[model samples]
Target: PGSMEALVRALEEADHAVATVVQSRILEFFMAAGRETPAGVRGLWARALRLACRAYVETGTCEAAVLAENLAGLALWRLRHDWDEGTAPLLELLGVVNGDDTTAALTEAGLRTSAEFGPDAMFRLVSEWCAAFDEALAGARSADDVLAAPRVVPPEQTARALVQPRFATLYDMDFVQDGLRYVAQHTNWALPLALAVRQMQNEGLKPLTRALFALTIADEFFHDRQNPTLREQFAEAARAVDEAALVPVGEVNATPRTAVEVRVSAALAHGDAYVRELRPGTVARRLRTDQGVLALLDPGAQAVHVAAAADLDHTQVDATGVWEAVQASASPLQVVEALVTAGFTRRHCDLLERAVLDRAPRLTDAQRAVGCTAVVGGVVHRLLDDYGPGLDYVRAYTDVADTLEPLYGDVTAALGLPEKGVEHVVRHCMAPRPPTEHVGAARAALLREVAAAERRAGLAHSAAREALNTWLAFRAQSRWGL
Candidate 1:
């Protein structure tokens, strides 16, 4: 048992890359264990076999080793020699190991031991085990079932559906307009539209602006989710905008514009900046909550870029510490609190909490505490309304008490930093909102003060150390007869 423990201990410290290599090999060895199994139904068998392999590695047991060896030998023997007597032990061994904790260990050890046998025998054992496990967990569903019929849009409305707008506001920021202008200057995609705008009169401005707004929205999305296929769609959409622009602006029927479009154009025409206020509808709310928003959109649209956005949103909050907290948590609210504590906005936390609830179903409970998603969203949206967009004003207010601990050294103490010190740090480092002119100047003063202190502290012992080193060098030179 001690020797076994030593072996297990050594294996435990094995480098992850090498362990993965071994694990991959084990998987390959039993790769075709359920090859003939139905495609949809094969995942269970794969998991079971992998689970056994993990158990085998963990246990390092000669007892489990022999059990696996006998199981493999008997399965092979029964296959070749028609030995009915071996069936009972083979089935019993299969049943014993067929099943996270105990299941994980048994399956791992089972795979480890079984893998030592020749591929022919190992395959027989694995195949037999997979078949049994599959039967126990779920019977294979044959592929003859019919899928629901898809609803088809009429041909005339197809163009309208495709051209339907997602963004409500047409006007954009200087950043957006500047980027579009850059694109027009440097890239050929927006060039034709620009050229058309130059040649055409003010009547063309209406349609041209419309196309430009479409181009801007598309570009914004591409920036957010930088996928290759999405880039292609953006390129095509730009070309499509250019094509629309080339048409005589006077001939283009501008009477059938959307209500939102009319409001957007009126605002743009009046020199009012496009206020991209985010009043999230049901779909956007669902997105915030980490729920499936695909169902909220048409199936085709949902399947395409919306799903991509969903996946992108899911991946955004994948910081190591935050995700680990989510996994370690036992409840949805716990997950939410952990994220909120980690400096994530409640909106983002809502997504993570929803994901946790889905993945760890056992964590689901009816402890419905007062929901903060609405409150958080409301406050942030209100702030955006007061101040403009394009600012990172919507983050959680992480308490500065714990963070100030490390900065509480001799330098700060000697300076006799007061409550205003905390305020400076908060304004400068912690909750850094855009500062007004006087406020910014004040913060800069505090920043310079701290920086000056840092410089003094850094050089405090430097002159003494240099002098001591120089004296030591002179003494060494004298001893060496230099």
Candidate 2:
């Protein structure tokens, strides 16, 4: 009652600051009291309440108006006899508050105000009042009328308005102007507008417009299946954008070779749907195809020409030639694979042979397994012969082998073998041969193991013999630089 009397005195005195303090104290009292007052002085309280509401709308802070509203609602039950008269004046005061004007003032204050109590205090007061008004008006008025409605503009016009100036600035050349004019005259304006959107990154325009342009370009390029190469290029470009925008180099263990190849290949493989499916293993499969393999490995050669050089018929061109072509054609995979294959040892070779034998069916299993081992052994032997134990060379080989384990798994599985550890296999086959006649004898022992594996697997004796002899000859030629 003392708090209410203070509020009335402050309001009657017409001092906004005193009225605000008194109203706040009264609200605090009501909140802390947490119970209704007696009905004997309810009329006096109701009169004080009306004065507080009027003071709030006239000169009190937004905080005072909010407090007045809440207390008025709570005091309504006791003042039920005077409800109609009390409610009318309060509603009128609320309607006169101009919440939108208050909100705009608050927003501007928040955006432009310096770090001072005067600025923040004003903003807080205005914002609270606006929020109270908004809550009061929630179901009373339609949102379309109560809030600012967004304006609709045609996409073409919006895009032009958004993009033209930025595009002109990005490429300050006449050619771009001419291109824009050409596009405007001969092609759809949407094309140039889209390009403009892509070139612009201003905060004033929607960021989604740039994404829309990218997706549009992608859709146009990949709509037809004939431009497979172009599609690939688009994919690579998209990946480059992602790498540039999203990934930090420090987070990735990507060497320059890996990074560049991944980016370039992604770009090149973008547009064609089939290009997406033509991953490393698919490329390997294609390399096995007489046309695909020859075109890739010996890019300018015909299948017949490659067959004549390899001294094999079309049917004889198998996974070996495919693997060989992949090694020779795709530089990224080749460099990596060569390094890994060079790290193999004799133990690795033996494990690989057994793994293959364990999984290989009868027929050509022995020759297939031995031939693979021979290729691996030759690579290791060549590395040891050329680079010796140089740490850099050995590291390169080890790194590549470790990276290529997944790829080799796919390759072996494609050839109907269970997944075996490619790195271990390479390591086993590539252990250094001992000095003296033992080197040749050890190599001979490896050859004999290949023959025995072939015999045990029930392969054609002559075929197995020819494969062993060919492998031996290949190894000999590789060692002698024939």
Candidate 3:
């Protein structure tokens, strides 16, 4: 059997010939060396060949270079082996090289020679390296042992820890000057490095968890590349991590209007229809007419309008009053249905139906009615139900409805009428009035009396207004005019 030094000499000879000789012969050399060598020596040969490939690629001999293809196939095979004993050191080495600026410079030099050396090449190289390193590290029992042992932390932790003193200082001394300089020099490496870390963390490697968080923070700060503020934030996060002052910045502690926080606030704000946040182990309460309106507009104190409207004995009412009642009712679904029946449009009906089907398919008819009424009332409910807790479904619902408002208005106009004529009926439903606007002044006076009575009784309307304009418009436009 050949000694390690002899094998090294043979590999060097192969490297020399790899560029000049037939590509097949060079591949054969690799296969031969791979077969005769012990595991450690074989690994060393693999590393040397990878370096050689990088060199050949840099020289623009990529088409003639068989190393990349061979290495990729070999790496895949190694990755599928028993990861504990077989693949750990390779993964560790990958983390070290990809995380290191000098090594990346070498890899970059090789990459520029050929367009065929794409992300796949990088992914294979890094993935195998990470897997090998992880396997080797698993053999060590303590952190001190880990330091002394031959191992590779996956690229994820390597990147994060590199931001810490040992690695960052080394990187600064070697390559990085500022955030821009760092990214400029290492973006190719960084992207795959980030992806590798994410993959490992997703695969349940618990040690990578903190690293992933650090990476996220880093990404947030360093994203724009052109943004000066981003660099400052990046530096701040780096400083915090280095000082061991990193804390789990929970969503609750974040700024109020951040995307995440706003969503959560909206959800909590609409918990009655979306969730039972105030009461554990309870389902959402279904609000009937007046109660539904009150629940929707909860904390808005519009219950008085609905209550006063409820006692009126007429069939027509003011549009603005019904709108207020619906807004205060806080139920998007109920409000939408009421708006439709009040003369909005069947288009409102169509949109609401689609939204409902997209969310809660298992809802009962009564539940569906209540939900639809809430929507018409302009109350936001949750959209998707599968995301589980903390996702702020109510906020999402509200956002979607708000986005659909312009479309809803168009549908209303298509159905015909100068205004949301359904609001008239909805207002009347809450507090009765004359069917025709001809009794306008007298009806207004009556409505004022009803509003006063509602103030005394402290009650309100229970449903949302249906927009009847679309239906009315459609009837007028149709050949069989109704």
Candidate 4:
């Protein structure tokens, strides 16, 4: 008696991950004890259910919900085994957990609706349980009071025959609904559409729901290069789904104000919304009450004002006090070491550039070369290692390469880099670029950069090379380039 509540107390005190583990163990032990207890012992079953309900109310874990489900199933089996006078209270408790015969179908149907239509499918079922407890205690003083009003003994075969099939359906329905919802929400929409079309064809959603889901995510599937046959099937599915059923009737503008009124009013009322014609543009806080959606005309094209920093000694300048220490070293090589130690991350690169600029005149040719390599190669290496092959790496490489452009002369002599020294090193370390619409030296510049980056990259060149070659291949096949 004391042990169960103590575990709940411990669970209440524990952090998220720890409480999750403790909550799981709480259900495990309760289920084992409930199984060992006599089925006819109504008082013990009531106490056990009260504890289960309390635990579920506290931790919103699915296991806690399942525990309550199991308790209700057990009580249900007792009610069927021997119909008697004492079954009413326990039946009421079952109504609270499992819902009545009508609401049980409502729960399953609600679960199926969320799974087929939108996201947040699992939480619908869990929140139903949460609502059940909220309602259970709304009229009661405590958890025990909720289950305080309360079942029987018969042959195993008789009880199993009477209650097992429906209970089995309940158990399987939970599994089926949960799995479908999981696939719908978490898995790729393609798999779900495929499953919804074929495996779930005869069950779960109606043709219109399946059709709607397929059509909603059809663009995603069509964009993929593979799956010609599935594309045809998805198209067929879209055609097969009754278009009339998918049409929306007038939905109540139940959300507070009128549709245009709400949005325009919200835009004006919100602090982020700015209309910038008057007084150097303050937030548009006051709109006329008569203003409609169409009336939200441009008030002289709202402009943004970025307030200039007043005191140059911002908090970041104080926080990164080590920038001054690194600057004091007055060596580009030392700056390079600092940048490398900071993982060549962009935010630090900004400060390191200032450090490099301060000491640029004092830097020897070799020191300048080391600084260029450290700034370029370190960033490229880290991006290549982290992102490997993607637009993310390409974008970062492009941005950083462009950002480092102005710093190039600072890292080299005022006479300009030689044809075969620092210039060559930077060129070899440069990232690949996609082909552009430019037809002259600008295009040639792009080609040279791509060739050098691809050659230097060797096996690591695929991501950017893929972008370049795809552009070239498309141009070769199409008349637009010519």
Q: What digit string (tens of lDDT, one per residue) describes model 1 on residues 173-256?
A: 111122222221222122112222222212333332333332233232222433333234233333333232121334433321
- The residue ranges of model 1 lying beyond 4 angstroms of the native Cα positions read 1-220, 224-482
Instruction: Sort the candidates on lDDT, descending order.
Output: 2, 4, 3, 1
> Candidates ranked by TM-score, best first?
3, 4, 2, 1
Q: Count the backbone clashes (under 3 Å) in each candidate.
A: 9, 30, 67, 0
TM-score of each: 0.15, 0.17, 0.20, 0.19
Of candidates 3 and 2, the better by TM-score? 3
lDDT of 2 at 363: 23
Q: Find the number of clashing residue pairs for candidate 1.
A: 9
* Model 1: pairs clashing at backbone N, Cα or C within 3 Å: 52-107, 52-108, 53-108, 54-108, 55-105, 55-108, 55-109, 56-108, 56-109
Which candidate should be chosen as best, given TM-score against the real structure?
3
Candidate 4 lDDT over residue span 400-426, tens digit each = 555444646454552134423333443
**Which run of 10 residues does model 3 get worst, by summed lDDT?**
168-177
lDDT of 3 by residue, 1-482 (tens): 32323334544554543444433333343333232222443355445445545545533343223333333322222222232244344445444333444245335544322111222344453454344334423343532232233243222222232233222111211111122122222221222223222322332322212222223323322332333332332233223222111112343332222322232222223421122133333222211222323222212222212221121222111334334444454332344333422322222233333443344545444334423443343322122111111112222333554555453444333323235433432332222111122123322332333333234334442000011123223422341122
By TM-score, the better pick of 2 and 4 is 4
CA-only RMSD, every prediction = 28.6, 34.2, 30.3, 32.7
Model 1's alpha-carbon lDDT is 0.28
Q: How much is 134 displaced in model 2, in angstroms? A: 16
